[PDB]
Structure 1
Amino acid sequence: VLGVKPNATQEELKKAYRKLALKYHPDKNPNEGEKFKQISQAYEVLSDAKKRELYDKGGEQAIKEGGAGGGFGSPMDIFDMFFGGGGRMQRERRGKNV
């Protein structure tokens, strides 16, 4: 979904969300505002110390987007999916029934 390969740097991803926020600029807060929020919060996860480290240490090779029963959600849910195998697989897509 992000158009990036497993060998992508967090910097690119950070850059992507910035563009995403500009691109998915809702200007309709009550309707498309939740979509923005997901990028903002997902971005915030990316900008999270632990998440950056974990990706940097040994996550990159898994960042291929499995899709097949991997916990598919929204484009921003990617991190929620990757960190969802620890008792969070029962959760829902971000922006589903909010």
Structure 2
Amino acid sequence: GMVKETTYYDVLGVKPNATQEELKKAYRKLALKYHPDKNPNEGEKFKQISQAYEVLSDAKKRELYDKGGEQ
């Protein structure tokens, strides 16, 4: 109803069981939807896209994310 407590996947418009490929593929698409040039409204929201895809772009960050995340 007001679910605002989900992980980085469900921020990024990919399911909680997306591959690293599905991340970077989706990321570009969403970037083009939310880019400040063509979306002055949602420019702050762009930051949540990066903040999610960041953790999900390094294999060591992902290693900990998968089983812990708060490190």
Deviation at 1:48, TM superposition (A): 2.8
Deviation at 1:15, TM superposition (A): 1.2
Runs of 4+ residues deviating >4 angstroms? 1-7, 28-31, 54-61
* Higher alpha-carbon Rg: 1
- Structure with bigger helix share is 2
TM-score between both structures, scaled by the size of structure 2: 0.50
Q: Is the 8 A contact 2:20 2:56 kept in 1?
A: yes
Q: 1 or 2 for the larger relative contact order (CA 8 Å, sep ≥6)?
A: 1
Deviation at 1:20, TM superposition (A): 0.8
Gapped regions of structure 1 (runs ≥ 5) = 62-98
Gap change, CA 1:3 and 1:47, over 3 Å in 2 = closer
TM-score between both structures, scaled by the size of structure 1: 0.40
Q: Is the 8 A contact 1:26 1:32 kept in 2?
A: yes
Counterpart Cα distance in 1 of 2:70 and 2:58: 16
1:39-93: per-residue Cα shift (whole Å, max 9, x none)? 12211121133233346789999xxxxxxxxxxxxxxxxxxxxxxxxxxxxxxxx
Counterpart Cα distance in 2 of 1:43 and 1:51: 11
In structure 2, the partner of 1:32 is 42
Counterpart Cα distance in 2 of 1:38 and 1:60: 17
Percent identity, aligned pairs only?
Answer: 100
Backbone CA RMSD of aligned residues = 4.3
Gapped regions of structure 2 (runs ≥ 5) = 1-10
